[PDB]
Design a protein around this ligand. Structure first.
Ligand SMILES: COc1cc(CC(=O)O)ccc1O
Length: 167
Protein backbone atom coordinates (compact mmCIF):
# COMPACT_ATOMS: atom_id res chain seq x y z
CA UNK A 1 0.00 0.00 0.00
CA UNK A 2 1.22 3.60 -0.84
CA UNK A 3 0.05 7.27 -0.36
CA UNK A 4 -1.20 8.19 -3.91
CA UNK A 5 -4.93 9.14 -3.88
CA UNK A 6 -7.66 9.47 -6.53
CA UNK A 7 -5.76 7.79 -9.36
CA UNK A 8 -7.63 5.78 -11.99
CA UNK A 9 -6.08 2.34 -12.50
CA UNK A 10 -5.17 1.77 -16.16
CA UNK A 11 -3.20 -1.50 -15.89
CA UNK A 12 -1.60 -3.74 -13.28
CA UNK A 13 1.13 -1.11 -12.73
CA UNK A 14 0.04 2.23 -14.33
CA UNK A 15 -2.31 4.73 -12.68
CA UNK A 16 -3.39 8.20 -13.90
CA UNK A 17 -4.82 11.43 -12.41
CA UNK A 18 -5.68 14.95 -13.57
CA UNK A 19 -3.32 16.82 -11.26
CA UNK A 20 -0.47 19.32 -11.09
CA UNK A 21 2.64 17.13 -10.56
CA UNK A 22 4.11 19.88 -8.33
CA UNK A 23 1.05 19.77 -6.02
CA UNK A 24 1.06 15.98 -6.06
CA UNK A 25 4.77 15.84 -5.16
CA UNK A 26 4.28 18.38 -2.34
CA UNK A 27 1.43 16.20 -0.86
CA UNK A 28 2.92 12.64 -1.36
CA UNK A 29 6.70 13.31 -1.08
CA UNK A 30 7.30 10.29 -3.29
CA UNK A 31 10.63 8.48 -3.35
CA UNK A 32 10.94 9.50 -7.07
CA UNK A 33 9.39 12.34 -9.05
CA UNK A 34 10.18 12.28 -12.77
CA UNK A 35 11.12 15.52 -14.50
CA UNK A 36 10.42 15.98 -18.23
CA UNK A 37 13.95 17.27 -18.79
CA UNK A 38 16.04 18.32 -21.78
CA UNK A 39 19.61 17.19 -22.39
CA UNK A 40 21.03 20.46 -20.89
CA UNK A 41 18.85 20.20 -17.76
CA UNK A 42 17.64 23.73 -18.47
CA UNK A 43 14.36 23.75 -16.57
CA UNK A 44 12.66 26.68 -18.29
CA UNK A 45 9.11 25.64 -19.00
CA UNK A 46 6.31 23.18 -18.37
CA UNK A 47 6.77 20.43 -15.76
CA UNK A 48 10.55 21.08 -15.67
CA UNK A 49 10.05 24.86 -15.20
CA UNK A 50 7.20 24.22 -12.72
CA UNK A 51 9.18 21.66 -10.65
CA UNK A 52 12.24 23.91 -10.63
CA UNK A 53 10.19 26.97 -9.56
CA UNK A 54 8.73 24.89 -6.67
CA UNK A 55 12.33 24.18 -5.50
CA UNK A 56 13.14 27.93 -5.47
CA UNK A 57 15.64 27.25 -8.33
CA UNK A 58 17.65 24.74 -6.25
CA UNK A 59 16.92 22.10 -8.94
CA UNK A 60 18.52 24.35 -11.57
CA UNK A 61 21.59 25.12 -9.39
CA UNK A 62 22.16 21.39 -8.79
CA UNK A 63 21.56 20.64 -12.50
CA UNK A 64 24.08 23.23 -13.64
CA UNK A 65 26.77 21.60 -11.47
CA UNK A 66 25.74 18.16 -12.88
CA UNK A 67 26.16 19.38 -16.49
CA UNK A 68 29.44 21.17 -15.70
CA UNK A 69 30.85 17.85 -14.41
CA UNK A 70 29.22 15.30 -16.75
CA UNK A 71 28.08 17.09 -19.91
CA UNK A 72 24.65 16.77 -21.45
CA UNK A 73 22.32 13.80 -21.21
CA UNK A 74 21.30 11.73 -24.24
CA UNK A 75 17.81 11.98 -25.72
CA UNK A 76 16.18 8.88 -24.18
CA UNK A 77 18.54 9.09 -21.18
CA UNK A 78 18.24 10.13 -17.57
CA UNK A 79 20.05 11.03 -14.36
CA UNK A 80 19.07 10.83 -10.71
CA UNK A 81 19.46 14.04 -8.72
CA UNK A 82 17.92 15.39 -5.51
CA UNK A 83 14.15 15.76 -5.18
CA UNK A 84 14.73 18.82 -2.97
CA UNK A 85 11.50 19.74 -1.14
CA UNK A 86 9.34 17.68 -3.56
CA UNK A 87 10.58 14.09 -3.33
CA UNK A 88 13.57 12.06 -2.15
CA UNK A 89 14.96 11.91 -5.69
CA UNK A 90 14.20 13.48 -9.06
CA UNK A 91 14.70 11.26 -12.08
CA UNK A 92 15.39 13.69 -14.93
CA UNK A 93 14.30 11.85 -18.12
CA UNK A 94 14.76 13.21 -21.63
CA UNK A 95 11.94 12.26 -23.97
CA UNK A 96 12.29 13.32 -27.59
CA UNK A 97 11.05 16.83 -28.36
CA UNK A 98 9.16 16.73 -31.67
CA UNK A 99 9.29 20.59 -31.81
CA UNK A 100 13.15 20.23 -31.97
CA UNK A 101 12.82 17.46 -34.65
CA UNK A 102 13.94 14.50 -32.40
CA UNK A 103 13.13 10.80 -33.22
CA UNK A 104 9.82 9.76 -31.54
CA UNK A 105 11.22 6.10 -31.50
CA UNK A 106 13.43 7.30 -28.59
CA UNK A 107 10.29 7.58 -26.41
CA UNK A 108 10.44 3.88 -25.50
CA UNK A 109 14.12 4.27 -24.43
CA UNK A 110 13.09 7.26 -22.28
CA UNK A 111 10.37 5.23 -20.51
CA UNK A 112 12.77 2.33 -19.89
CA UNK A 113 14.56 4.55 -17.34
CA UNK A 114 11.44 4.24 -15.11
CA UNK A 115 12.09 0.49 -14.72
CA UNK A 116 15.10 1.26 -12.47
CA UNK A 117 12.70 2.58 -9.77
CA UNK A 118 9.99 0.59 -7.99
CA UNK A 119 7.50 3.48 -7.72
CA UNK A 120 7.43 6.87 -9.50
CA UNK A 121 5.28 9.97 -9.78
CA UNK A 122 5.68 11.08 -13.43
CA UNK A 123 4.55 13.54 -16.46
CA UNK A 124 3.37 11.87 -19.57
CA UNK A 125 6.69 11.97 -21.48
CA UNK A 126 6.89 13.74 -24.88
CA UNK A 127 3.36 15.15 -24.46
CA UNK A 128 2.34 18.83 -23.98
CA UNK A 129 5.02 21.24 -25.19
CA UNK A 130 7.28 18.22 -26.26
CA UNK A 131 5.10 17.87 -29.31
CA UNK A 132 4.30 14.15 -29.45
CA UNK A 133 0.87 12.61 -29.55
CA UNK A 134 -0.09 12.05 -25.90
CA UNK A 135 -2.27 9.02 -26.69
CA UNK A 136 0.87 7.47 -28.20
CA UNK A 137 2.97 8.43 -25.14
CA UNK A 138 0.48 6.75 -22.80
CA UNK A 139 0.51 3.59 -24.94
CA UNK A 140 4.33 3.50 -24.95
CA UNK A 141 4.31 4.04 -21.15
CA UNK A 142 1.93 1.12 -20.46
CA UNK A 143 3.80 -1.12 -22.92
CA UNK A 144 7.29 -0.27 -21.55
CA UNK A 145 7.17 0.54 -17.83
CA UNK A 146 6.86 -2.53 -15.55
CA UNK A 147 7.33 -0.70 -12.22
CA UNK A 148 4.53 1.22 -10.54
CA UNK A 149 3.93 4.58 -12.15
CA UNK A 150 1.51 7.28 -11.06
CA UNK A 151 0.98 9.65 -14.01
CA UNK A 152 0.02 13.22 -13.27
CA UNK A 153 -1.53 14.97 -16.31
CA UNK A 154 -1.87 18.75 -15.84
CA UNK A 155 -4.33 19.58 -18.67
CA UNK A 156 -7.96 18.55 -17.77
CA UNK A 157 -9.26 18.21 -21.33
CA UNK A 158 -6.01 16.13 -22.12
CA UNK A 159 -6.78 13.80 -19.13
CA UNK A 160 -10.40 13.24 -20.19
CA UNK A 161 -9.28 12.48 -23.76
CA UNK A 162 -6.57 10.03 -22.56
CA UNK A 163 -8.99 8.12 -20.30
CA UNK A 164 -11.80 7.99 -22.87
CA UNK A 165 -9.43 6.71 -25.61
CA UNK A 166 -7.36 4.24 -23.55
CA UNK A 167 -7.31 0.68 -24.90
C1 LIG B 1 6.04 16.13 -20.72
O1 LIG B 1 6.06 17.43 -20.23
C2 LIG B 1 4.85 18.12 -20.25
C3 LIG B 1 3.65 17.43 -20.40
C4 LIG B 1 2.50 18.19 -20.35
C5 LIG B 1 1.11 17.56 -20.53
C6 LIG B 1 0.25 17.71 -19.28
O2 LIG B 1 0.52 17.09 -18.26
O3 LIG B 1 -0.75 18.46 -19.39
C7 LIG B 1 2.55 19.50 -20.18
C8 LIG B 1 3.78 20.18 -20.02
C9 LIG B 1 4.90 19.48 -20.09
O4 LIG B 1 6.07 20.09 -19.86
Amino acid sequence: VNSFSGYLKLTDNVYIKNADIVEEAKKVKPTVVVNAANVYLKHGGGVAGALNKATNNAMQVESDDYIATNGPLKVGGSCVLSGHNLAKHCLHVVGPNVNKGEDIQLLKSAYENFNQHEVLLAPLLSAGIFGADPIHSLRVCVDTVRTNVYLAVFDKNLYDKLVSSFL
